[PDB]
Each structure stands twice: as C-alpha cells, then as structure tokens.
Design a protein around this nucleic acid. Structure first.
Ligand SMILES: [Zn+2]
Length: 18
DNA sequence: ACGCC
C-alpha cells in the first residue's frame, strides 16, 4: 500500500515529509 | 491532510 502525502510506497501520510 | 500497510 502507498503513501498519499507523497505517493510513494510503504509509509504513511501522517509521517511523510515531502 | 486523511486512511491503510
Ligand atoms: Zn510519503
């Protein structure tokens, strides 16, 4: 499943960084 | 930013 803050694989929106 | 993993 994919991060949606960035759109990369693995990690969460909430913990993203962009 | 939110949700899930
Ligand atoms: Zn991300």
């Amino acid at each position: 499943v994919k991060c949606f803050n960035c759109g990369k694989e693995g990690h969460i929106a909430r913990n993203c960084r962009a």
